[PDB]
Design a protein around this ligand. Sequence first.
Ligand SMILES: *[C@H](C)[C@H]1/C(=C/c2[nH]c(/C=C3N=C(/C=C4\NC(=O)C(CC)=C4C)C(C)=C\3CCC(=O)O)c(CCC(=O)O)c2C)NC(=O)[C@@H]1C
Ligand SMILES: CCC1=C(C)/C(=C/C2=NC(=C\c3[nH]c(/C=C4\NC(=O)[C@H](C)[C@H]4CC)c(C)c3CCC(=O)O)/C(CCC(=O)O)=C2C)NC1=O
Ligand SMILES: CCC1=C(C)/C(=C/C2=NC(=C\c3[nH]c(/C=C4\NC(=O)[C@H](C)[C@H]4CC)c(C)c3CCC(=O)O)/C(CCC(=O)O)=C2C)NC1=O
Ligand SMILES: CCC1=C(C)/C(=C/C2=NC(=C\c3[nH]c(/C=C4\NC(=O)[C@H](C)[C@H]4CC)c(C)c3CCC(=O)O)/C(CCC(=O)O)=C2C)NC1=O
Ligand SMILES: CCC1=C(C)/C(=C/C2=NC(=C\c3[nH]c(/C=C4\NC(=O)[C@H](C)[C@H]4CC)c(C)c3CCC(=O)O)/C(CCC(=O)O)=C2C)NC1=O
Ligand SMILES: CCC1=C(C)/C(=C/C2=NC(=C\c3[nH]c(/C=C4\NC(=O)[C@H](C)[C@H]4CC)c(C)c3CCC(=O)O)/C(CCC(=O)O)=C2C)NC1=O
Ligand SMILES: CCC1=C(C)/C(=C/C2=NC(=C\c3[nH]c(/C=C4\NC(=O)[C@H](C)[C@H]4CC)c(C)c3CCC(=O)O)/C(CCC(=O)O)=C2C)NC1=O
Ligand SMILES: CCC1=C(C)/C(=C/C2=NC(=C\c3[nH]c(/C=C4\NC(=O)[C@H](C)[C@H]4CC)c(C)c3CCC(=O)O)/C(CCC(=O)O)=C2C)NC1=O
Lengths: 161, 161, 161, 161, 49, 160, 160, 160, 160, 160, 169
Amino acid sequence: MQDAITSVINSADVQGKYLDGSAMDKLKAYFTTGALRVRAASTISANAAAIVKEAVAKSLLYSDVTRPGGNMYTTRRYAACIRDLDYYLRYATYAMLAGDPSILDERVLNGLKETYNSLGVPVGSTVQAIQAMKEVTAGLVGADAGREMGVYFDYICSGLS
Amino acid sequence: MQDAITSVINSADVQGKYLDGSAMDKLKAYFTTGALRVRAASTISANAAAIVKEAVAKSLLYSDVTRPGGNMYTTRRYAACIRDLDYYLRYATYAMLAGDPSILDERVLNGLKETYNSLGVPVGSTVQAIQAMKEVTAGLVGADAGREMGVYFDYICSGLS
Amino acid sequence: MQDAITSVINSADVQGKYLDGSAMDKLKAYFTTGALRVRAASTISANAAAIVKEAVAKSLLYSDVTRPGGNMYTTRRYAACIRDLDYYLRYATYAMLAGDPSILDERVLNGLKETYNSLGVPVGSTVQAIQAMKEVTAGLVGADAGREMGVYFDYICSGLS
Amino acid sequence: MQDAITSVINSADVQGKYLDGSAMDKLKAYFTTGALRVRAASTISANAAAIVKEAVAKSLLYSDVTRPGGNMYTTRRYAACIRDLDYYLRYATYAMLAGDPSILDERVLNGLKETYNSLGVPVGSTVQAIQAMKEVTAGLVGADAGREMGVYFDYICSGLS
Amino acid sequence: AVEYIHRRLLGRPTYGRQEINSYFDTCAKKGFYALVDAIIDSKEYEEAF
Amino acid sequence: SIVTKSIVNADAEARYLSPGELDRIKAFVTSGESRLRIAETLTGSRERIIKSAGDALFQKRPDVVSPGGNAYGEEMTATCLRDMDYYLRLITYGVVAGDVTPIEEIGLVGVREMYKSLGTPVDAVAQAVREMKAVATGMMSGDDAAEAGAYFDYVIGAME
Amino acid sequence: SIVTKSIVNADAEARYLSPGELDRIKAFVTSGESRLRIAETLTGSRERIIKSAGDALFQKRPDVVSPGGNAYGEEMTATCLRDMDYYLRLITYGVVAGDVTPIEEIGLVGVREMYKSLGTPVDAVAQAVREMKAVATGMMSGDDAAEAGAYFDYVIGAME
Amino acid sequence: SIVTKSIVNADAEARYLSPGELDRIKAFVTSGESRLRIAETLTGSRERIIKSAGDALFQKRPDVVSPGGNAYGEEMTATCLRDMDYYLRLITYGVVAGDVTPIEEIGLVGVREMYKSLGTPVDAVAQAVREMKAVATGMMSGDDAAEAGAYFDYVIGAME
Amino acid sequence: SIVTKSIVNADAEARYLSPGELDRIKAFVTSGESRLRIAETLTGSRERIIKSAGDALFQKRPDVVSPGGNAYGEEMTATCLRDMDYYLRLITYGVVAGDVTPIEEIGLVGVREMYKSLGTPVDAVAQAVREMKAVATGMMSGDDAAEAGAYFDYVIGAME
Amino acid sequence: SIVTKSIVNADAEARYLSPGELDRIKAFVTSGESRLRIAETLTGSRERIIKSAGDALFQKRPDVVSPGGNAYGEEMTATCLRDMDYYLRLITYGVVAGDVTPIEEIGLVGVREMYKSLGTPVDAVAQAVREMKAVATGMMSGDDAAEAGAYFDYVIGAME
Amino acid sequence: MRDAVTSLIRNYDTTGRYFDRDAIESLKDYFASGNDRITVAAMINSQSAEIVKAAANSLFEAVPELLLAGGNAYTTRRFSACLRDMDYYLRYGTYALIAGDMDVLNERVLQGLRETYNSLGVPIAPTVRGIQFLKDAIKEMAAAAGIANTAFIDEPFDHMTRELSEVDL
Ligand SMILES: *[C@H](C)[C@H]1/C(=C/c2[nH]c(/C=C3N=C(/C=C4\NC(=O)C(CC)=C4C)C(C)=C\3CCC(=O)O)c(CCC(=O)O)c2C)NC(=O)[C@@H]1C
Ligand SMILES: CCC1=C(C)/C(=C/C2=NC(=C\c3[nH]c(/C=C4\NC(=O)[C@H](C)[C@H]4CC)c(C)c3CCC(=O)O)/C(CCC(=O)O)=C2C)NC1=O
Ligand SMILES: CCC1=C(C)/C(=C/C2=NC(=C\c3[nH]c(/C=C4\NC(=O)[C@H](C)[C@H]4CC)c(C)c3CCC(=O)O)/C(CCC(=O)O)=C2C)NC1=O
Ligand SMILES: CCC1=C(C)/C(=C/C2=NC(=C\c3[nH]c(/C=C4\NC(=O)[C@H](C)[C@H]4CC)c(C)c3CCC(=O)O)/C(CCC(=O)O)=C2C)NC1=O
Ligand SMILES: CCC1=C(C)/C(=C/C2=NC(=C\c3[nH]c(/C=C4\NC(=O)[C@H](C)[C@H]4CC)c(C)c3CCC(=O)O)/C(CCC(=O)O)=C2C)NC1=O
Ligand SMILES: CCC1=C(C)/C(=C/C2=NC(=C\c3[nH]c(/C=C4\NC(=O)[C@H](C)[C@H]4CC)c(C)c3CCC(=O)O)/C(CCC(=O)O)=C2C)NC1=O
Ligand SMILES: CCC1=C(C)/C(=C/C2=NC(=C\c3[nH]c(/C=C4\NC(=O)[C@H](C)[C@H]4CC)c(C)c3CCC(=O)O)/C(CCC(=O)O)=C2C)NC1=O
Ligand SMILES: CCC1=C(C)/C(=C/C2=NC(=C\c3[nH]c(/C=C4\NC(=O)[C@H](C)[C@H]4CC)c(C)c3CCC(=O)O)/C(CCC(=O)O)=C2C)NC1=O
């Protein structure tokens, strides 16, 4: 768990060097993008349940997975699916605020593949659900904030696949 | 891979005991049902392609899965679907002949859920296809041979779900 | 895979330093023990099958594991058990010759616990078999060569447990 | 593949006798040559590239072969030529170490003639290059081992011609 | 090593346990050279390549 | 068994059971009654088979019971008769199953490696199964002796 | 010898001989006199070694000389001593070679298969070479006994 | 090393160490004292070896230090002497280990690819190791110079 | 040429030539006059190209003309210009062939091995063909310079 | 079911089934015939139950079918009747099992979270099950209507 | 856990269909034989601590090494642990006799039993022979008490020793 600042400090410390001009430029880049990160995080905190339910309405609804036999069939499985998608959106917001995806592979992508493979959860359908969540939130917060959200959404989909 | 005879022998051997009267009664039950198993296997070997195409004509045809976007859309996917259904009917015939479903979880249900979840194959639609295959072959071979086919068809659908 | 010489060189190289007096003393210790290692390796190569069959005659014979229900029951399982014990004695001879147990956790203890846990192999019974093999070969080659064999036998038993 | 030792053992084996004193005489002859054989082999192994470059600079360089119109014109054919010369020198060193030209008849001169006829390689230029290499290695490693290399280079030339 | 050499020389992973108990037995009584020799011998190699 | 072998042989070929294999399974299903009669004949008289076969074996091959052999002493001769009892039990399993995959798949795969690790001459074990075959086919009718001697024949053939 | 083995090693690795194995060939060259002395003393007393080792083997394992055993009779015991003669001969060849490879080429490839054919118990042959080893190392001086016992040890290791 | 190579070569062959390989390991174990003496000789006088070898190299091959060459300038000549120091250190490792698997397995596998990516003539590096060999074998006794020159010989041979 | 390469492609794929590569051969047939003009202008001014490129190479990289370097002396510099002559000749052959394959067959297979033998730094040869490329494209018109620079670019790519 | 609940409740307590629980299982086993009759009554007339209950629901709660509601349109009303069919199927399962663990363990745990994520008023779903209960208990005898209305009562109670 | 009823319910639920003719016939087949299972269960609840002891003594008469020196039922601590294990087997065999399905045995007995036994040194073989000494005792005792059919008594112990069983065939 480290943001862009802590990773820059960790690189300069593992070097043992002081903060040179490249580290200063990286921190200036983060300190310019931080206000946009803050406003996108507020806008995403506004519409958590709406983004999640629009992602299910785009991908998972009216398909076979909500029908009998699907892994999203029962009300318990539906509630756990909404819980999993809320987790993905919340941690993508955290990784957007930090500017570093270390929290994603520390706390989402750690044992997620083995959990989903033990439960029988389809990984492709949940990857499509995360992609639709990314599409909806990029329609919500704009072009560049949607892109800096979608880089961590693509990180979650890549670590899941 | 073991039939009713080999499983009875394996139980009596793991006991270390000789074949007592209960094992003799189990083997007498199998040796009474074996002729019906043979005739049903011949009747199913007669009409493999007809049972498969009637199962697709009952369930999967004219639905969304053969339309664009479905997982049964292309000719490659259609041919692979017919191949998968022929596999299910062939191994259900084998498990009917053996009288034991050990071949099904040894050689069909082993990595089938993870394969179908990695490919994006709908499990509910293929479970409905196997159920229609069961309904067609139970209409073909009669009541009790259809039941002893449907127990292994239900085994395949339960291990797939 | 590295002997005492290669591990000393690797330590002095990861330091980036030349070979100082402590490394010279370690290599002098290995170059004094090497002739005893050679003679013990020849004596163990003499009596491979005898040491293995005396280890089975001490521990595994006439117990429950060679009876029905045991994991050493069938002739296939007996042959695979003799094969596994020959592997343990051969790699303990290699680790005795190198003077470093890196080959043991590189090439024996790598996936051995998970293999034995997937097969259903008892780990305590095979640890007792390796201990009896150690006792027999320490009776064979003497006190100190038996001790420098038993340190790698204890390494195999510790990594297995 | 036979040494002086293996040829002595082989000859005593075809007629069926044990080791006689004349065999021991040949064996001690081989050993008292073999010490200087080792030192000459180390000297040839140290300077093989300079030996080959002096051999081609002596005989093949300013002729029609290294010129256009010869079989040594292109860089493909030049690289094949240097590789052929390196292989002649290496196998001559092996025959010098073993004390028997059976390796040259076994691995070098097996099918080298017919491929040299079929590719159109000049035999005379190769023989001149090998003889130039012979007195290059004779001036390098000394007189008696120069004669040792001389009969094995002559064996290669006689098998070639 | 049996599994990775099988994936390299036969182009596919192994199927089950018999197949691995048979190749690692060739590795047992004879060694790695006979492992390569038994993989290159196999009828799937002849039929595939 | 027969059904396992037919199912597997059709299973690799990606086809159903051919009708010839199906009447093979049908004929084995009908002959199962005679197979069970041979199995009761072999099961009920196992004491006399093991006793007389051990007697004729140690008469035929006396060096394995002499000091220096494997089966020398009380417990070693008891273990020898136990190994013969194991092989007669596998003979009964192969008689019932209609094929030698119980016998081979239990007690014939690594038999050479096991009896080499124990220090046992395998030819004397083949003589033990030969005497067991003599006593067992001396105990039945003609076709029953032929059908049991097929599996006894397979065991002695798989020894050497 | 050691030179053929170093040559096939440098051939498979497609390089020249390393100065380590050049020094190995040179040390083998200088130790030729010691190995000549060992093979000389072994070729001297081969009959006494064979007689004491054969009587020690027959005293240890009487199953081979018993009736029904392998080496029963005058000619069979003489052929047993002939096989011990062949193995001591290969021991001397490997002692003078500096390597175990002529023992491998002449008498170690198919000894289990051919003794499986003749009916010879191979562990009895391992005991015979064990007694030959004990007697020959009892004859030699301790350093030369260690050298000859290395090759004897290799033979009994490849036996059992 | 020698022990690693013998263990691996017996390890692929599914056999134990042959007795000839065992006396090879024993002879290397006894010669380790002279190996450590050669290593102290090479270690203690590394300054004069690197200095005199760099001097004789730049005398012999002046174009690499002339403007246009690789080792032109202060820091480039310092890196050149550092690369020579690396190779003398690997020479010391190969002297102790008794084989060239430290030298090859550390600094000789992709040496052509590395020095082609740096823009370095590899023949001038071979001349650098040649001058290092001249200064080092000018520093020792006869057999010590031969044993160190074997590994120096391997490095110059593995260059070209 | 392009026709041999299309033929070996249709041969390995075991089919006739596709109409796409028939149209490729037809377009190559029509562009024969442009490639004849390019090879004509290159065969015209080969001496001026070689002289300016060799002096530019010696001005850029003086290590080869320095004492101790490769191309030191009158005959060595003349052989350097002869090798540049061979490479410009192969450039003209590949320009008129429409393909890089005669340049591959004649002068690109073992240039690293043979220049590893002669001691020539191969990156210096890449710089020489770079200067020949810059001078020849300075002579040509820009479209024809792009065509000839494709083959020159391929040669310096296969060099380094 | 009843047997699952009794087994689990004795299972946590580390005891066997108490005799009162055993006559509970016995009484449920005897009343299974009437349970199967109620199940056939509910199964055979599902069309009229779903149709009349949907009609009375949309009569009672017209805003969910008006534009602006959830079940507005053809496919949305079809999905609404499908959800009612799901709940009648779970009612039949709970009637057979003798307890509400099928109904709760399939379609009542996360029903609020699911219908909040879909945008559905849950009170209108409770009215749908109320109209289903009215049509179903209008279809049976008295004690049969009470026994089915217990499970209908549980579903409407678990809604709110 | 699953009885036979919840087994049929989960079987019909995953496809989303109602009960047909055959589902009602199989439910009638469980409900008709329900009383038989319940008097067998009550007759086992009569003599549970007697049946466990009798099956234990018959097992120790079968394999005599376990009471002796190197055996695993050696001391009184090990003897009492083995008899408590046989009490567990009879308890969950009664639970599967009442439920009529093997899911209680799979979820609470057989899942990971082999791991504990292989680790602790507890043998798996006389465990199985003791389970079916319990089965034979229960079978003859309930066949003595007027009950005609014994297939449901045959069911759970045969399942439990098909699962702890080593597949060597
Ligand atoms: C007795 C006939 C056999 C035997 C038994 C034996 N078992 C143990 C120890 C344990 N047994 C268990 C078993 C279970 N735990 C469960 O939850 C279930 C399912 C309900 C079973 C079957 C466990 C957990 C233990 C560990 C002790 C504990 O409970 O904490 C021993 C003791 C082993 C020791 O030496 O310590 C014995 C002797 N052994 C035999 O020989 C008989 C075949
Ligand atoms: C281990 C024993 C062994 C040898 C010796 C051997 C030789 C050998 N030399 C070959 C070619 C060659 N050898 C030469 C030789 C020469 N150049 C000349 O003109 C001179 C006459 C001579 C230089 C001294 C040439 C020019 C070719 C390549 C001709 C061609 O195919 O284009 C080839 C064809 C493949 C190749 O291109 O390399 C083989 C197999 N193979 C072996 O296994
Ligand atoms: C070189 C490192 C290495 C090891 C050690 C190894 C072990 C190994 N042992 C195995 C089996 C086995 N191992 C045993 C051994 C034992 N069971 C017992 O009861 C005894 C306590 C113990 C012997 C002392 C048995 C009986 C089997 C066969 C299991 C079976 O066939 O079901 C298997 C299963 C596949 C096969 O037999 O061929 C592997 C992979 N594999 C390796 O690559
Ligand atoms: C069902 C397949 C199967 C077989 C065959 C089997 C054999 C088997 N035979 C053994 C011993 C033995 N078997 C024999 C048998 C013989 N020696 C002779 O001389 C006679 C020729 C021959 C019998 C007629 C002897 C003497 C031993 C004891 C070996 C010893 O104590 O070293 C042992 C070791 C002790 C034990 O646990 O019983 C096994 C596992 N196990 C099996 O699971
Ligand atoms: C232990 C095995 C090993 C070797 C050999 C090694 C070589 C090595 N040599 C380098 C540079 C160099 N090495 C040389 C050396 C030479 N140029 C000449 O003209 C002389 C012929 C020759 C030395 C006598 C030069 C000039 C550079 C600098 C290259 C540049 O700056 O572009 C560098 C890049 C900078 C660095 O990180 O040091 C490496 C990694 N590294 C290793 O780990
Ligand atoms: C068409 C394919 C082809 C190539 C590439 C080729 C190269 C080639 N280059 C040679 C020499 C040479 N080439 C060079 C060239 C160079 N060294 C330098 O300093 C310069 C940087 C570089 C020039 C770019 C030198 C100096 C020699 C003489 C080497 C010597 O005599 O030791 C020779 C030896 C003389 C002869 O037989 O003509 C050949 C064959 N021959 C061919 O047929
Ligand atoms: C067996 C347990 C179970 C239940 C209950 C269940 C409900 C369920 N209801 C859905 C939709 C729905 N269900 C309703 C139902 C209603 N809206 C109304 O206004 C009425 C009050 C009410 C029915 C009378 C509607 C309108 C939708 C569509 C929601 C939408 O399209 O956004 C969907 C999403 C599409 C689908 O895959 O069917 C599920 C999964 N699934 C289950 O597995
Ligand atoms: C180390 C201390 C220690 C002891 C002694 C011990 C005894 C012990 N005695 C037993 C049985 C028995 N013990 C006896 C007899 C006797 N018992 C006596 O202490 C009297 C000396 C004698 C009667 C005069 C009998 C007859 C049985 C069989 C009981 C049965 O049928 O269950 C059993 C049940 C297993 C068996 O059949 O052996 C144990 C564990 N356990 C222990 O850990």
